[PDB]
Design an enzyme around this catalytic site. Structure first.
Site, mmCIF file in Angstrom:
data_model
loop_
_atom_site.group_PDB
_atom_site.id
_atom_site.type_symbol
_atom_site.label_atom_id
_atom_site.label_comp_id
_atom_site.label_asym_id
_atom_site.label_seq_id
_atom_site.Cartn_x
_atom_site.Cartn_y
_atom_site.Cartn_z
ATOM 1 N N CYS A 31 32.627 36.614 23.841
ATOM 2 C CA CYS A 31 32.425 35.803 25.064
ATOM 3 C C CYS A 31 31.311 36.420 25.930
ATOM 4 O O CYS A 31 30.455 35.688 26.484
ATOM 5 C CB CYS A 31 33.763 35.654 25.779
ATOM 6 S SG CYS A 31 34.505 37.245 26.237
ATOM 7 N N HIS A 201 37.593 37.414 30.338
ATOM 8 C CA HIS A 201 36.783 36.413 29.627
ATOM 9 C C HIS A 201 35.465 36.287 30.392
ATOM 10 O O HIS A 201 35.461 36.559 31.558
ATOM 11 C CB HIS A 201 37.566 35.112 29.521
ATOM 12 C CG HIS A 201 36.932 34.029 28.697
ATOM 13 N ND1 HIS A 201 36.149 34.291 27.617
ATOM 14 C CD2 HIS A 201 37.022 32.673 28.754
ATOM 15 C CE1 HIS A 201 35.722 33.140 27.098
ATOM 16 N NE2 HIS A 201 36.264 32.141 27.757
ATOM 17 N N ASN A 221 32.645 26.870 28.888
ATOM 18 C CA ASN A 221 33.339 27.837 28.012
ATOM 19 C C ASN A 221 32.627 27.855 26.666
ATOM 20 O O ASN A 221 31.732 27.059 26.464
ATOM 21 C CB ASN A 221 34.816 27.452 27.883
ATOM 22 C CG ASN A 221 35.693 28.588 27.389
ATOM 23 O OD1 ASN A 221 35.199 29.699 27.175
ATOM 24 N ND2 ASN A 221 37.011 28.349 27.355
HETATM 25 C C1 U9X Z 1 35.875 37.468 25.127
HETATM 26 C C2 U9X Z 1 37.150 36.784 25.752
HETATM 27 C C3 U9X Z 1 37.907 36.226 24.594
HETATM 28 O O1 U9X Z 1 37.316 35.933 23.569
HETATM 29 N N1 U9X Z 1 39.198 35.950 24.564
HETATM 30 C C4 U9X Z 1 40.034 35.945 25.686
HETATM 31 O O2 U9X Z 1 39.674 36.313 26.797
HETATM 32 C C5 U9X Z 1 41.339 35.518 25.254
HETATM 33 C C6 U9X Z 1 41.279 35.177 23.938
HETATM 34 O O3 U9X Z 1 42.282 34.733 23.146
HETATM 35 C C7 U9X Z 1 43.673 35.121 23.452
HETATM 36 C C8 U9X Z 1 39.874 35.381 23.333
HETATM 37 C C9 U9X Z 1 39.908 36.255 22.051
HETATM 38 C C10 U9X Z 1 40.665 37.643 22.080
HETATM 39 C C11 U9X Z 1 42.143 37.560 21.581
HETATM 40 C C12 U9X Z 1 39.866 38.719 21.270
HETATM 41 C C13 U9X Z 1 36.098 39.025 25.183
HETATM 42 C C14 U9X Z 1 37.359 39.560 24.483
HETATM 43 N N2 U9X Z 1 36.141 39.608 26.559
HETATM 44 C C15 U9X Z 1 35.327 40.584 27.003
HETATM 45 O O4 U9X Z 1 34.417 41.048 26.323
HETATM 46 C C16 U9X Z 1 35.463 41.079 28.460
HETATM 47 C C17 U9X Z 1 34.274 40.529 29.270
HETATM 48 C C18 U9X Z 1 34.334 40.795 30.797
HETATM 49 C C19 U9X Z 1 32.954 40.628 31.461
HETATM 50 C C20 U9X Z 1 35.383 39.902 31.423
HETATM 51 N N3 U9X Z 1 35.601 42.533 28.525
HETATM 52 C C21 U9X Z 1 36.443 43.246 27.765
HETATM 53 O O5 U9X Z 1 37.329 42.754 27.006
HETATM 54 C C22 U9X Z 1 36.254 44.759 27.772
HETATM 55 C C23 U9X Z 1 35.168 45.322 26.867
HETATM 56 C C24 U9X Z 1 35.042 46.855 26.759
HETATM 57 C C25 U9X Z 1 33.831 47.226 25.929
HETATM 58 C C26 U9X Z 1 35.093 47.558 28.144
HETATM 59 O O6 U9X Z 1 37.477 45.333 27.227
HETATM 60 C C27 U9X Z 1 38.623 45.389 27.978
HETATM 61 O O7 U9X Z 1 38.688 44.886 29.092
HETATM 62 C C28 U9X Z 1 39.712 46.175 27.199
HETATM 63 C C29 U9X Z 1 39.443 47.750 27.306
HETATM 64 C C30 U9X Z 1 38.396 48.300 26.300
HETATM 65 C C31 U9X Z 1 39.253 48.400 28.721
HETATM 66 C C32 U9X Z 1 38.991 49.908 28.902
HETATM 67 N N4 U9X Z 1 40.063 45.573 25.885
HETATM 68 C C33 U9X Z 1 39.209 45.704 24.664
HETATM 69 C C34 U9X Z 1 40.607 44.203 26.037
#
Ligand code: U9X
Ligand code: NA
Length: 254
Positions: A31, A201, A221
């Protein structure tokens, strides 16, 4: 400037076809990269008076940015916009259209909703490798197909500031906290009522409006055209709903 009661980037800049394009991130947490290359495609076209009319490669950014986080396991907005400024991003469309330098390798799938594509499911692809190679049919070398920005910035966590930025410079990328009830969204103005957090997201804000006195942001989206309102959703505006006003990032080509 006076902010209008509604605004739609698709109506202001109709020659920039990227603005009305809904993409699909497929079985990948990309995303962060989709919201980036979408808003960058839009802003490249808007800020060049329609000269740079391109669809930037999600897979180039997703696979090659070393500072943007964990690829298909999720990423970080600031470094995506810095990547565009410093390295730039090549062109590339969907798997299905396979246009441009580096089209997306992953197929369209349904994201917790009904429709005509196969269900995404729960299993994630491996992050693609940084291949630095245009498809055989595309006759520009990879490095020479790069589109770069001049600046990148976070936008102030102020409703009117966000509205002025969108109206003057084009669609923005924005993060928000996703709760389980977002997966049940079909239509209308979303706000979080039920469910636990599923993390963050990243989406593309293209404008705003008001219906029955309720103000909203209009958002693209990246879960294909079957999701939500032909790929779009609306979310409460002015109350930092799910932190929608607090993680806005964008940038300019000049
Ligand atoms: C894209 C969002 C997404 O694809 N999905 C959802 O939000 C909900 C979904 O379905 C249930 C889908 C698919 C998932 C199940 C994989 C993406 C996952 N989101 C991100 O990249 C966000 C973006 C910000 C700007 C909102 N950030 C993160 O997820 C960060 C990324 C790391 C590199 C910091 O990760 C986290 O927040 C977290 C930790 C690594 C935090 C220390 N994890 C990996 C969730
Ligand atoms: Na729909």
């Amino acid at each position: 400037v006076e902010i209008p009661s509604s605004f739609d980037s698709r109506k202001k800049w109709p020659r920039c076809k990227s603005i009305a394009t809904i993409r699909d991130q497929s079985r990948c947490g990309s995303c962060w990269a989709f919201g980036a290359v979408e808003a960058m495609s839009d802003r490249s076209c808007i800020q060049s008076g329609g000269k740079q009319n391109v669809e930037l490669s999600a897979v180039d950014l997703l696979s090659c940015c070393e500072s943007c986080g964990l690829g298909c396991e999720g990423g970080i907005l600031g470094p995506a916009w810095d990547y565009w400024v410093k390295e730039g991003i090549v062109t590339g469309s969907s798997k299905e259209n396979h246009a441009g330098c580096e089209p997306y390798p992953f197929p369209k799938c349904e994201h917790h909703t009904k429709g005509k594509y196969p269900p995404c499911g729960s299993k994630i692809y491996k992050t693609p490798r940084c291949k630095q190679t245009c498809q055989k049919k595309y006759k520009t070398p990879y490095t020479q197909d790069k589109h770069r920005g001049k600046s990148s910035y976070n936008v102030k966590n102020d409703e009117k500031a966000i509205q002025k930025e969108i109206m003057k410079y084009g669609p923005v990328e924005a993060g928000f906290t996703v709760y389980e009830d977002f997966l049940n969204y079909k239509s209308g103005i979303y706000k979080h009522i039920t469910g636990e957090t599923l993390g963050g997201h990243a989406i593309r804000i293209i404008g705003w409006g008001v219906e029955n006195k309720a103000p909203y942001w209009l958002i693209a989206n990246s879960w294909n055209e079957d999701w939500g309102e032909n790929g779009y959703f609306r979310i409460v505006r002015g109350r930092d709903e799910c932190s929608i006003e607090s993680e806005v990032t964008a940038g300019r080509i000049n």
